[PDB]
Amino acid sequence: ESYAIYVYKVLKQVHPDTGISSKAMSIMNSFVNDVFERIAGEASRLAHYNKRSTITSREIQTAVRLLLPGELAKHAVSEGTKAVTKYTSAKKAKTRSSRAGLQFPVGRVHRLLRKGNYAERVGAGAPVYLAAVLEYLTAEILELAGNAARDNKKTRIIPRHLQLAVRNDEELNKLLGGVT
């Protein structure tokens, strides 16, 4: 699965004038995919303890607290909770983008959770929460990688900028250092 269009949208928010090379985008895609897979796998395991074979935002949140190190978990939980609150708000938004305040599309995350057969059903809040978590991590990595590119006197993020940015951040290194 390719998140490239959404990675690119997030990049334009955090570093409007910075590009990203094809190989750096591939690494970004692998990071998002790896985090999705591990959150979904933990959430699926957690769902067995409930009476209903359903992935809800509660299992996503618990999975995020297990998987994300240190303050990454605190901020991801804040982002996922805020997105679910906004998405379920009584005042309806007029567009999908305005409903959750996100760049990552809820429907794509929903389809990926359903495709993985993580449970019999996927609750309406779970893909919103997970999309917000993936967006938060993507924004964090791209912010740091774009800083590394600028310090390297480059106008595009290349793989060594991503590798340096992840390695030099203790929490991101724990989360991502095993991704190949």
Partner: peptide, 13 residues
């Protein structure tokens, strides 16, 4: 991974 150089230089500048 070397922090400098062009061993893996990608096109598009």
């Amino acid at each position: 991974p070397s922090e400098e150089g062009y061993q893996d230089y990608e096109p598009e500048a």
